[PDB]
């Protein structure tokens, strides 16, 4: 069960990594601060890192108790 759940993440890891890395935000939202930041502050976004490795690190933090369940779910979603 664990290996299937992680294999679903890893088999699509390259396309979600390329999608997150090539996330071109629109201009009027940057000029008028209409985009959120709650997930970037907490380093919950997945920019600059491999998506599957960031999933592993976030799940390790969630297991260790330093990460809330809701923020982990929000970052994953």
């Amino acid at each position: 069960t664990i290996y299937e759940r992680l294999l679903e993440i890893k088999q699509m890891n390259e396309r979600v990594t390329k999608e997150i890395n090539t996330r071109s935000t629109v201009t009027f939202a940057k000029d008028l601060d209409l985009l959120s930041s709650q997930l970037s502050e907490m380093g919950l976004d997945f920019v600059g890192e491999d998506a599957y490795k960031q999933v592993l690190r976030l799940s390790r933090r969630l297991i260790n108790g330093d990460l809330e369940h809701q923020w982990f779910e929000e970052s994953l979603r």
Binding site: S24, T25, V26, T27, F28, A29, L34, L35, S36
Partner: protein, 384 residues
């Protein structure tokens, strides 16, 4: 052995299929509102239109303001008493029409707002002028999002629909075209349009709808038309959460078989936005690509078509999918970065064109859709 599980191919336009596109928009349509707590909002029309203007799509098409329909022209399908009640009822004199309120199903689930007659006139005029421009050859694609009221019937208002403008448009198409195919990708069944053209072979009404205990309840697979209209009303019952690949692998074979079997001369495409994921009343899981793939696939046949926008009760998603569908009819693919419009605050948090599908269960199994498409294909053998 009919249904094939195929992944959703990316949307690609055909450069050899350039169409003269006519756009029908009356700036007033949006200033009408069903109610305070009501899901249907004509305001979705003008934020869709604001996305057309701000994408610079008006340089590849002609924008028209159709003349609003008069009383009689509405009576090409509806009765005199129903149009007379619709043109006279207001929220003020609702107590003066109580028998007609329950007779014509107006007052609950189809409320009386004081711009009702004008809204219906705009919708019917847009549909009829799009059909008329298709008849004279002035355009190849007629776009009218002001209408789409496919639930309205001869003497009643149902499903937030009062004037069945699609029947008026198909009537105007039938004066110059022998066979008109109506395609309904709205999540609800096109009961008004199918009921109107149930007994005729001149109009084939195809509806891709959710059929459960869902509105309007009509739309069983065995509903194939009676009399001379037998096997000329294709109903495709679907379950909840159909995704883009599943909807494509259902839609494209059925519409292709209708194209090479029924051979229509004009196409009416109901682009209900309630087939999108995240709709207030809809229960499908279509992204904007999945919704627009139907419009792009029906565009490939070259038949003079009338794109008419129907449902859609979350305004942002239906506006974005209508803008993408309209851009697809000009043989361009709009970039997934929304321009600045006056309603830019709706499309958060990413402010992009895309409508993201939900991660809910695609319960439409391949065996069920295989049986559905097998019976549909078997019924279509008599339409040559």
């Amino acid at each position: 052995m009919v249904y094939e599980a195929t992944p959703f191919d990316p949307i690609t336009v055909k450069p050899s299929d350039k169409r003269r596109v006519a756009y029908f928009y009356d700036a007033d349509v949006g200033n009408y509102a069903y109610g305070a707590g009501h899901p249907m909002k004509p305001h979705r029309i003008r934020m869709a239109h604001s996305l057309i203007m701000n994408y610079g799509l008006y340089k590849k098409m002609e924008i028209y303001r159709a003349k609003p329909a008069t009383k009689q022209e509405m009576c090409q399908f509806h009765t005199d008493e129903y149009i007379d009640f619709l043109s006279r009822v207001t929220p003020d004199n609702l107590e003066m029409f109580k028998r007609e309120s329950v007779k014509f199903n107006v007052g609950d689930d189809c409320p009386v707002f004081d711009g009702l007659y004008e809204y219906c006139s705009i919708s019917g005029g847009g549909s009829m002028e799009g059909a008329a421009r298709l008849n004279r050859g002035k355009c190849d694609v007629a776009v009218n999002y002001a209408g789409g009221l496919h639930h309205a019937k001869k003497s009643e208002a149902s499903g937030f629909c009062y004037l069945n403008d699609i029947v008026l448009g198909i009537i105007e198409l039938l004066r110059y075209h022998p066979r008109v195919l109506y395609i309904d990708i709205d999540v609800h069944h096109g009961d008004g349009v199918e009921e109107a053209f149930y007994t005729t072979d001149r109009v084939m009404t195809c509806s891709f709808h959710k059929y459960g205990e869902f509105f309007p309840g009509t739309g069983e697979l065995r509903d194939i038309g009676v009399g001379a209209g037998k096997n000329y009303a294709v109903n495709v019952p679907l379950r909840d959460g159909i995704d883009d690949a599943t909807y494509r692998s259902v839609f494209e074979p059925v519409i292709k078989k209708i194209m090479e079997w029924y051979q229509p001369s004009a196409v009416v495409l109901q682009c209900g936005g309630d087939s999108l994921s995240g709709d207030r009343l809809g229960c499908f899981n279509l992204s904007m690509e999945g919704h627009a793939n139907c419009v792009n696939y029906v565009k490939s046949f070259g038949i003079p078509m009338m794109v008419v926008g129907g449902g859609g009760y979350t305004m942002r998603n239906v506006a974005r999918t209508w803008c993408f569908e309209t851009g697809l009819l000009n043989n361009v693919v709009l970039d997934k970065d929304l321009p600045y419009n006056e309603y830019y605050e709706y499309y958060g948090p990413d402010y992009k064109l895309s409508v993201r599908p939900s991660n809910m269960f695609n319960v439409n199994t391949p065996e069920y859709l295989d049986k559905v498409m097998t019976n549909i294909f078997a019924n279509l053998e008599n339409t040559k």
